[PDB]
Symmetry: C3
């Protein structure tokens, strides 16, 4: 069964990738969640150290800034999910 | 070799997915690690701003809260690892 | 087309895994980015609570420490990308 092994493997791939995509989304969701807390912490610190110019000036450091890249991961996930659907679609016609 | 291409591709899939699962676990481990530091930071801030009602009241903001979803990622990883084992198991009988 | 299904599935796998690897890298990049902010926050707190021994002593807690594991994820990604290249290479000779 050649045809058969092709369908089989395509569905194995698809079922693994559904779980990977799910995981990627959830890891990104947790970064987004955690970042809101971290930046609320930073704003609180900026107020506490305002007399000294806020957190970075207070320390005598260049500011570290968070670069949120949820857009990239979200895009890659949706592309993976498209590829899953396309493989199934192609087998279906 | 049809049979052969099926075994081959199944093992390629399995070896890629072992590394993906490993990565997902490690990303989750780092979120868990980092979150403990962020929340210790928050508790410290809640004490420093206690006279003002803690961090959120001090800022005049609704609190941001971290939603830990390690359970979801852990579950998806273990499901991926089950699927790896099942494919190998099926080829073995 | 047995040969054909083997090439096809190998390239499907490869194109999904390129996007997974990309995602893993980006999730790690965001952890690295966020961790710099969290630890700058911690250092600021250590100064504010220095009279009390820094953040952990101030709270009466054992310190929580961030364990960065970018090296692990970076390694797994590069291994996945090697496996992609090797599959293509093998089909090419
Ligand atoms: Cl923080």
């Amino acid at each position: 069964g050649s045809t058969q092994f092709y369908y089989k493997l395509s569905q194995e791939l698809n079922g693994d990738m559904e779980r990977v995509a799910d995981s990627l989304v959830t890891l990104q969701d947790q970064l987004n969640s955690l970042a809101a807390v971290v930046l609320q912490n930073r704003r609180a610190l900026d107020l506490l150290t305002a007399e000294r110019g806020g957190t970075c000036l207070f320390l005598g450091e260049e500011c570290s800034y968070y670069v949120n890249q949820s857009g990239i991961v979200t895009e890659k996930v949706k592309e993976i999910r498209d590829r899953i659907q396309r493989r199934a679609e192609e087998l279906r016609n």
